[model samples]
Target: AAARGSHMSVNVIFGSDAGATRAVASRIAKRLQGRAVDIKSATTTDFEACSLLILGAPTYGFGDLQTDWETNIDKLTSANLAGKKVALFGTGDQTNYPDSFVDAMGLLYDHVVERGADVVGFTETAGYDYTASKAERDGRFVGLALDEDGQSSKTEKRITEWISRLT
Candidate 1:
């Protein structure tokens, strides 16, 4: 029951306003093509239909989840995700909020892990300078971390490299 997935079915769900997280999700989808994977907004996705759930959200207002993600948090929490394989990725501002970079992903992870989902996708924290972060679970990030605001030049490469490890 550890991090098991359908392998043929994956869903990438994101919540964003300026579409930065949306763009990353789309690129991730390209890497997941030829498999049964689809990227959609969190508000519109049915998590029960997905065995491999990839969640993304932008950290806002001092590390809180985006409003749209907050709206659907209840649904994710209420669902029975026992043995669901989960991965997380999130957008954050390293310079503006160094202490809370990509912190929203941790919030999402709390709910999923609480429901007995087995999570994966912990990435090394290279090319990022931050004071502190809830996103860091150990020597690596709790998930893939992208500083789209401060490191736009590195985002694509980081996204590609991270997605490569996903499947």
Candidate 2:
């Protein structure tokens, strides 16, 4: 069941180099009435304090995590996320990297799931022109996938509706 009242227990943590993921994370945090924390500066305790988390990142070259995410992966993974409810989001360039769009989210998903997170917020794979993606599971994305390069116009609405369902 969803929590009631203010979403102070929710944390929107993100790693962004080009600010696309940061922007999306901020929007999600705002919609949830939570706070957005930059993963580069976030500590293990920061993650431990949250009852719910929305983790976000941008996919880099050949389905890799963003630089800050790569550096801070352990900080997040070190936390005891057992039974924690987590949602995911990622930014990708579907036009340039169709084969690996939002793959970073898949990587993040693996790490969190391995730590025992109850992941939620999967989105349908409609209206996306991708050849392949690790983020896809059972015909849906593991979470939200935004394309700042090719499909920026859809991001705001996507974020809005995704949070509506999540919250």
Candidate 3:
């Protein structure tokens, strides 16, 4: 299959503390033939250049966004995403924080949609065991949710399944 300009315009941007999210982002980027950009060093220019965005982050204390994401979120939000395609993903501890699994993904999802980006990659909630999640909508997660804590074995399968339908 031939790659389109849109394929080259894809970017997998993410923030991670303990490296799980970053690893996931890199895998996504490779699968999509895109670049993996760390949110800490990312700029509005990175967001501007991508027509398709694969964004991810690890949830932190009390369902909060990761530090790099919190600090550099403005760069992402500032970009004009009126016609961009955005797919969200997040790392969370579903076993311990069942009530807040992938909340950061939901938060980021809202911001991109507010910026007029067309969000995609919503996944089924069937395999997940969570009490609650802000990322859930119509019985589906707003994005792909991974638990590197208790469900690390499922991450690759989940990501591949999500990416298969992404484009």
Candidate 4:
């Protein structure tokens, strides 16, 4: 992306009250190592430097976002995301919150898209057994959704396959 000189690069930001979100974000950063991908906490995000911001947050009770987002969501919704590329990913427990798995990603998607950022990385809803979720848009996940509680076995593989489609 840098070679193209389009000024589009990737940064991963996540809020993890639990470790799963951090794990996923770290995994992605490691996979994209030479590409200069950055993985930082939502609180420490460098707003201006982000060209392609990949955001995530752990889902809380009743499909709520992690506390960091609750505290700093204005950073995304209020920033100048016009023409920037954004991606989404999140962690949740489908078995316990089948109807709310990765629901926080939906919130991030809505905010960034409304702010004029071009969103990418929508993952298929197939292979995921969940009752319902706000993360789904037209039967597709707003972005990659992972379940560490039940689908931990699929996490690494899903991350690899999903990131492959990122470009």
Per lDDT, the best of the predicted structures is 3
lDDT of 2: 0.88
lDDT of each: 0.77, 0.88, 0.89, 0.76
RMSD in angstroms, candidate 1?
5.4
Better of 1 and 2 by TM-score: 2
Instruction: For model 3, state the Cα shift of residue 31 in Å.
Output: 0.7
Q: Candidate 1: misplaced stretches above 4 Å?
A: 1-8, 34-45
After superposition, which runs of candidate 2 have C-alpha atoms over 4 Å from their true positions?
1-7
Which ranges in model 4 have alpha carbons more than 4 Å from their true place? 1-8, 34-45
Model with the higher lDDT, candidate 2 or 3: 3
Residue 59 alpha-carbon offset, candidate 1, angstroms = 0.4
Single out the weakest 10-residue window by summed lDDT for candidate 1: 34-43
Order of models, best lDDT first: 3, 2, 1, 4
Q: Residue-wise lDDT of candidate 2 within 99-144, one digit each (tens)? A: 9999999999999999999999999889799999999999999999
RMSD after CA superposition, every candidate: 5.4, 4.1, 3.5, 4.4
Model 4 agreement with the true structure over 23-142: per-residue lDDT tens digits = 778777667541222233333345436666788788997899887788777776667778887788888888889888888988888888888888888899888989888889999998
- The C-alpha TM-scores of every prediction are 0.85, 0.93, 0.94, 0.86
Tens-place lDDT per residue, model 1, 1-167, is 56432345677777887888888877775576512222333333456667577888899997898888777677677777889878888899999998888899889888888899888888988788988888888778878899888898988888787767766
